[PDB]
Amino acid sequence: VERIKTTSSIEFARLQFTYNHIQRHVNDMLGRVAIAWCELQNHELTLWNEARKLNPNAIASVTVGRRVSARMLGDVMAVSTCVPVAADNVIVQNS
């Protein structure tokens, strides 16, 4: 047999309840946001497939990271890095 000692402050329990409620709700909402983001990307892969067939240059450049020149060999993209040219060294012909 024994005797049970009770703490005189319950604020640990109420704090636990508050934190648990907030954690559960925020985790739920963020899980939904993450799942929606995942589905959106898996969903827009189709737009990206059907845009690269219009002009592969822009899609390939924005995708790889560099500024590359690309073409399509069927179901793949063949790329090649583009060489920079200084701004001041261009002439536009008048006509």
Binding site: I22, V33, W37, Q41, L45, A60, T63
Partner: peptide
Amino acid sequence: DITTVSTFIDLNITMLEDHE
């Protein structure tokens, strides 16, 4: 056998860790 570029925008959402 082919290098894979990505058309995906990463979103590394973690979760509120359990706390006691």
